[PDB]
Amino acid sequence: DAPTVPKARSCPFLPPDGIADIRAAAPVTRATFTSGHEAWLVTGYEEVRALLRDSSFSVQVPHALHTQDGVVGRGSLLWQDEPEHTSDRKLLAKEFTVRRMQALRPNIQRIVDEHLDAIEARGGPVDLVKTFANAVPSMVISDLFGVPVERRAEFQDIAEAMMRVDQDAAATEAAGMRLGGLLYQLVQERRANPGDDLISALITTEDPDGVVDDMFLMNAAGTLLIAAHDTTACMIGLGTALLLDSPDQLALLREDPSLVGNAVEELLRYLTIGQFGGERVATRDVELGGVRIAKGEQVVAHVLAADFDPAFVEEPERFDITRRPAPHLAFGFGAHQCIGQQLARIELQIVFETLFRRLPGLRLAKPVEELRFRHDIVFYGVHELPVTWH
């Protein structure tokens, strides 16, 4: 009967003032979480950072936005006990490199431009979620996986159905089984004709050792696609809405287009999508913030609270794209820190730069209070985002 976690905010566009008092008084405390179980709630920036850094806490339940009901071992990272996590991550990171992510900029520009061509070809108003936020990220992954333009239609549909919710338990599993089939065939085809893509590169990676089999490759491909899709789509949808509901910051961006990178980092901090780190368990006794956490006890990082700690940034409640980017914890920290963060940053940069440039006078087609948020314990995004432009 530890107290329930205080609600941080009623809307992602507001400061999370509801968690401030706990963070200030007790940055490591006991709370009861939505499942009805108690765990250590960690909200201070310093302590969340120290928790994520410490391999004494192993992940039991991954970050909520990186998993689907829903899907489908070695190569998945998310659902991986140690020491396989470490070695499988090292294998994947050998080919899914920051270099490979940077190398996708022209692909990302192309994809973003293609989606905006379709949008302005039709006008006006459009739902930015269906036409853009949900569509772009899976097509970037399609390119990462070497999917021919053919070929994209099928990939988009299957990935889309995977995100769909609401779909019933069955419908949900059937979507997962179709994705599984697609990915299995994809792996066979890349074996049959290798290319310059990530899957081809893994098939051919240094593997002493022999862990990279078809199962490993399906697990990695599924994980990256699923992890990249709802996270990035949420950032695009909520980030666009937050900018549109912040005419002060939008004006600063329009006055100084070089702020796009700063704006992406501030949106990441401000929204801290998913709110919590994956639930961890102590594999040994550990002292965190002066508090003894016993082996076997659960620990939940309140990353949103950490990203609003006044010890971390000044006047944290302010949404201010002029800030020099600070090391927020929206991509985590330590061993499980987000492996796709450079890709996410690159995609959001191209997305926001192109959107606001190509659709001058972009604005909400309906007041903000009419937006409908996907919320299930935490916010997953907006259902639709009706927009117009000049």
Ligand code: HEM
């Ligand atoms: C778009 C915004 C994204 C955000 C805000 C985000 C956030 C995070 C966070 C906070 C973690 C750490 C979870 C924890 O320590 O409990 C994480 C891990 C992870 N992320 Fe992301 N992510 C994003 C995009 C992506 C993308 C694009 C990919 C893949 C291309 C991805 C793949 C992963 C994977 C596989 C992990 C687990 C890494 C491991 O367990 O070693 N994420 N992400």
